[PDB]
Amino acid sequence: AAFRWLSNKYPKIISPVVEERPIVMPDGTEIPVDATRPNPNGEEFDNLYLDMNGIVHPCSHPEDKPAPKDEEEMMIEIFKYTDRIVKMVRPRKILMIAVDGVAPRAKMNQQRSRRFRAAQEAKEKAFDSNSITPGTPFMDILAASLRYWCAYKLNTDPAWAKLKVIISDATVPGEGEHKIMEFIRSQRSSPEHNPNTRHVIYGLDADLIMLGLATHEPHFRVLRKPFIWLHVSILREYLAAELEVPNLPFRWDLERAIDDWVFLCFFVGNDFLPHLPALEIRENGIDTLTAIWKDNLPIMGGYLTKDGHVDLERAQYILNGLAKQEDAIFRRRREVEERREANATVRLWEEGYADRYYEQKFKVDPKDIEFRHKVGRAYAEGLAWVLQYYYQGCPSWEWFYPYHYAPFAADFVDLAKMEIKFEKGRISRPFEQLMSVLPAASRHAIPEVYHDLMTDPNSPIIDFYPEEFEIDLNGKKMAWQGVALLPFIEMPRLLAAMKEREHLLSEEDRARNEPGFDVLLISDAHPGLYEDITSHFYSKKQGAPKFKLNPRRSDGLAGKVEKIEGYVPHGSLVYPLARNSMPDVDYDRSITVRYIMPSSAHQHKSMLLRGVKLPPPALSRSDIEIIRSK
Amino acid sequence: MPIEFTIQPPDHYAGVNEPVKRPREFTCFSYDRERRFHLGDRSLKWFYPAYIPSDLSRGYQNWQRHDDSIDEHLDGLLAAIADYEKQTGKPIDAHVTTWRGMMTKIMATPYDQEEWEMNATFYRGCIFIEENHAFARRKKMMESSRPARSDGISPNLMQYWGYKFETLSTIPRPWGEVSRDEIESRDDEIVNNMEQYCSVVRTGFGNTIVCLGGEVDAIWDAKPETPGEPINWVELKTSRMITNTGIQTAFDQKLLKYWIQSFLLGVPRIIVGFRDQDGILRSMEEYETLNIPYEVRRRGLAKWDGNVCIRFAALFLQWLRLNITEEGVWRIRRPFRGSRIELTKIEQVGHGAIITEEFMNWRIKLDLQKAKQQ
Ligand SMILES: [Mg+2]
């Protein structure tokens, strides 16, 4: 839905990737593509970021192959796919592999709501795809396999000789996109960061282009049988033509208009909150909110957002402009639907429509008006959480929205009177995630000491694990469009039940539940940083075990690195899995250190850096006058 | 008899690539808004650009001025060098010491017709040079006694359209550490020009090694990890919009002095702001200190070439090192359109006020340390 909307509204942001393909010889051998040459796309990229769950899920249950018969066969297919990306991107200065860690509670509720459906479908109707979760035996095998493959590449591929390889595996918290964004913010905060640094990101989700805008790096690219580029620079030209308004009582500033448009996109739909009854992206709800924003921008006295914080007094004007239209939008929807479906229970198009809605969906007495306003305030708090999570890192790990449904815009009263404050909370341990987001069918993925809690009628938490649950299709046509009426986790009860037991775990299981660390790997060829790491950590004049990178010697990677205990440099590299389907190396040319980002103690800021040199116009005078007219 | 150095036409000096020993910063000092001297970089600022349409005349009544009736001689430069000598336990190897402004006037002399006047002195084999403050003040009294132009533009208003553009174009910390409000609010900050960062550099022309002091406006990123590497300095300047090629001639003549002034401290980048004739800022442009002579040569609208300036400075410095050999004060003068620089000894002993007693006492202590070491 998001792509079909974007492609049709902004078609010039797309271009096909120039791919150079390996030569196959008469004996069936493959010649590897020499990536030391210039990139055939005609522009050179400093950094590549991989959202690795955009690869691991496809390999386990593909559309166009049989599934892999064992875990080693799956790791080999993951290397083949990952290698193909680096051959076409050819990153000159950083490669980052990010794997999903433990997520914030607000996201876990959406995963639980996905996985209970997958289990009830399999129950109503081999490798369980729920095994792709932090703290399973499968994620341990992946976490070893990726470090081997990077070390092996740093020994055997000349284009990687100057590359830094940064790994953030499943033992480190946060989702891949919410790791990658924090690394980009860390680099932008550094005083020596090159303002014309070129970035690429690989991943499946439509949020990546919204994140692209929210970086404010102008040359940023997004990547996704053939491949296509999306350019953030071309989308910024579209928005600069479309969002402009004359004669405003304040200085016009494009970055603020782009942030307001980004917020109005997350308002229409996101993973953390149910979408408003009045809005679906298929109905061009983004245009409706944009029109309301352009009509109120002359009188709000300024923009709706400031560096990822939202002005609730200004938000009221937007919601009032929507509330005046809800009854017309419902009539327009129902007229079009009843017209279409004639030609092919709540009654939203008749009078009294909101009283029947609150009765049928929330089970309240319709005459309680202030309950509607309470749901409204809870939803507005949700919108404030979502924007901060994208622009300023995770604002609370324990917050969530406690309803299966959304209020009407007519329920948002006096937002200017709200107080919004968030508490950071405790990040869940990997087993605390696994017990939160698994139904009892997949319990083979978790230690035996917890299995009873999922299935025993005497379990103190059995109510969190229903054997059957209601799905409301809500006038939609598919069980993936409908809402699962699953009960919410009372987190203290689950944590108490797992604080009891725990001493029963194996010493391996108890070790697997600890938090991890990021690592940087480099090749012995690197022209300065390898001299520094060997001299500072491994010469006889042993220094402190923590070290600060220098941007003139690191090629602009800024941060700190740490010596790893018990590791010995330049031993033999050994392939970890049973059948030796990949080579060993007798003397490993690579070296490994822990890696630490420069911490965002400040807010990040939505501004162009000094020394930015924006690309020349991709849009013509005619394209600008067409979109201004539309 | 008076002593004289003949200024030949540029053609006489041209075609010889006299070697320049690349500028190194080796000590630095700050003035704050109240004109207290401090060692180190506390008054340095980071560059970050202005809002393109803004009024340079805004706030003119509130401008805090450094009072140029006060004479500071060399005081900060001598103090900053004396600290480096205390830190290293040796005298510096440079034997000529000056503000950049005198070095610019010398280097411009083959092309510029303007008159200039200087006082100079010698001590323990080393030479020190300053502008004659009395001549500068008398010239500025005569310039301010002229009748106004038909456009009404005051030279003082032109000078404020200087410093306002520096306040619109800077921030007190790297971009990563300032708030949004500290960038957006800058139109309404009241301008001060008593606050400065002075960089001291070691440099040399041919066989002579020279120590220069001078002002530097801003830096593009952090200072380097170790001394003597190139630094990403910026100089900020303002002039009227180049509306026609008659203005381009005057601008390509200004670029001789801009290039000298940024070259002598190793400043790699100049950023120029263009005002309209009422004082609204209309655009900004970037120039590189290595390429300014090449661009002016390529347009051909002005006729100057820095190899003349460099060799003229080397020959003139060597001529001073031949003619000046003893203490007292000498006056150097260039008459208006004069074909010869004049030299004369004006005071027989001491230094006037060109050198501090603290600097004398420090060098006396240092020569006593040489004797004690030997
Ligand atoms: Mg300046």
Q: Is A275 helix (H, G, I), strand (E, B) or coil?
A: coil
Report which DSSP code applies to A149.
Answer: H
CA of B236 to the centre of ligand 1 (A): 4
Contact between residue B25 and residue B199 where contact means Cβ atoms under 8 Å apart? yes
Range of the domain at B179: 3-373
Contact between residue B118 and residue B131 where contact means Cβ atoms under 8 Å apart? yes
A417 vs A430: CA distance, rounded Å: 39
CA dihedral of residues A585, A586, A588, A589 (deg, nearest 10): -100
Residue of A188, A306, A610 with shortest CB distance to B48: A610
Q: Is B79 helix (H, G, I), strand (E, B) or coil?
A: helix
CA of B217 to the centre of ligand 1 (A): 5
Amino acid type, B290: L
Q: Is A414 annotated as a binding residue?
A: no
Helix (H) or strand (E) holding B28: strand B20-31
CA of B77 to the centre of ligand 1 (A): 19
- Do A191 and B174 make contact, defined as CB atoms within 8 angstroms? yes
Contacts of A608 (CB under 8 A, 6+ apart): A195, A216, A218, A255
- Concatenated DSSP letters of B335-372: -TT-SEEEEEEEESSS-TTSS-HHHHHHHHHHHHHHHH
Chain breaks in chain A (C to N over 2.5 A) after: 125, 224, 344
Q: Are strands B116-123 and B329-334 parallel, antiparallel or unpaired?
A: antiparallel
A189 touching chain B per CB within 8 A:
yes
- Do B175 and A609 make contact, defined as CB atoms within 8 angstroms? yes
Determine the residue of chain B that is closest to A602 in CA distance. B177
Chain B residues inside the 8 Å CB shell of A254:
none
- Would you give the distance in Å from CA B330 to the centre of its chain? 22
Q: Where are the beta strands (DSSP E) in A25-139?
A: 30-31, 47-51, 94-98
Phi then psi dihedrals of residue A165, to 5 deg: -110, 115
Distance from CA of B178 to the nearest CA of A (A): 9
Structure tokens at A63: 């559309």
Smallest CA-to-CA distance from A144 within A169, A176, A173 is with A169
CA of A170 to the centre of ligand 1 (A): 52
Select from B45, B46, B52, B175 the residue whose CB has the most chain A CBs within 10 Å, as the one to mutate to test that interface: B175
Q: Are strands B233-240 and B269-275 parallel, antiparallel or unpaired?
A: parallel
A553 vs A531: CA distance, rounded Å: 10
B143 vs B157: CA distance, rounded Å: 14
Q: Is A582 helix (H, G, I), strand (E, B) or coil?
A: coil
Distance from CA of A306 to the nearest CA of B (A): 9
A191 touching chain B per CB within 8 A:
yes
A581 vs A77: CA distance, rounded Å: 12
> What is the rounded end-to-end Cα distance, in angstroms, of chain A?
21
Longest dimension (CA), chain B: 70
Q: Is A284 helix (H, G, I), strand (E, B) or coil?
A: coil
Smallest CA-to-CA distance from A146 within A563, A526, A518 is with A518
Distance from CA of B47 to the nearest CA of A (A): 7
- Do A610 and B47 make contact, defined as CB atoms within 8 angstroms? yes
Contact between residue B269 and residue B235 where contact means Cβ atoms under 8 Å apart? yes
Residue of A189, A306, A552 with shortest CB distance to B224: A552
Measured from the Cβ of residue A487, the count of other Cβ atoms closer than 10 Å reads 10
- Do A605 and B180 make contact, defined as CB atoms within 8 angstroms? yes
Helix (H) or strand (E) holding A319: helix A312-323
**Count of residues making up chain A:** 630
Residue of A192, A307, A550 with shortest CB distance to B221: A192
Chain A residues inside the 8 Å CB shell of B224:
552
Residue of B176, B180, B220 with shortest CB distance to A190: B176
A268 vs A285: CA distance, rounded Å: 7
Contact between residue B203 and residue B25 where contact means Cβ atoms under 8 Å apart? no
Residue reference for tokens 């006096």: A414
Contacting A residues, span 547-586, partner chain B, CB-CB under 8 Å: 550, 552
Number of structural domains (chain B) is 1
Distance from CA of A231 to the nearest CA of B (A): 26
Q: Is B236 annotated as a binding residue?
A: yes
Residue of A189, A190, A307 with shortest CB distance to B180: A307
Sign for the CA dihedral angle at A300, A303, A307, A310 comes to positive
Contacts of B279 (CB under 8 A, 6+ apart): B55, B56, B57, B157, B161
Q: Is B74 annotated as a binding residue?
A: no
Distance from CA of A552 to the nearest CA of B (A): 8
Structure tokens at B265: 């401290």
Determine the residue of chain B that is closest to A253 in CA distance. B51
Q: Is A588 annotated as a binding residue?
A: no
Structure tokens at B328: 């007292």
Contact between residue B334 and residue B111 where contact means Cβ atoms under 8 Å apart? no
A327 vs B318: CA distance, rounded Å: 91
Helix (H) or strand (E) holding B4: strand B3-6
Chain B residues inside the 8 Å CB shell of A188:
176
Residue of B49, B180, B221 with shortest CB distance to A191: B221
Indicate the angle between helix axes A369-391 and A254-268, nearest 10 degrees: 130
Structure tokens at B210: 């020279």
Contact between residue A94 and residue A46 where contact means Cβ atoms under 8 Å apart? yes
A258 vs A218: CA distance, rounded Å: 12
Q: Is B169 helix (H, G, I), strand (E, B) or coil?
A: coil
| Listed resolution, Å | 3.3
Experimental method, per PDB record: cryo-EM
**Burial class of residue A524 in the structure, from the number of CB atoms within 10 Å of its CB (0-12 exposed, 13-18 middle, 19+ buried):** middle
Smallest CA-to-CA distance from A555 within A526, A589, A591 is with A526
Report which DSSP code applies to A609.
Answer: P
Report which DSSP code applies to A273.
Answer: S
Determine the residue of chain A that is closest to B170 in CA distance. A610
- Do A251 and B51 make contact, defined as CB atoms within 8 angstroms? yes
**Burial class of residue B337 in the structure, from the number of CB atoms within 10 Å of its CB (0-12 exposed, 13-18 middle, 19+ buried):** exposed
Q: How far is CA B83 from CA A163, A518, B93, B354, B365, in A?
A: 44, 45, 15, 18, 13
Domain ranges within chain A, ordered by starting residue:
246-420
- Would you give the distance in Å from CA B374 to the centre of its chain? 39
Select from A190, A610, A613 the residue whose CB has the most chain B CBs within 10 Å, as the one to mutate to test that interface: A610
Amino acid type, A365: D
Residue of B176, B179, B225 with shortest CB distance to A191: B176
Distance from CA of B52 to the nearest CA of A (A): 11
A412 vs A372: CA distance, rounded Å: 8
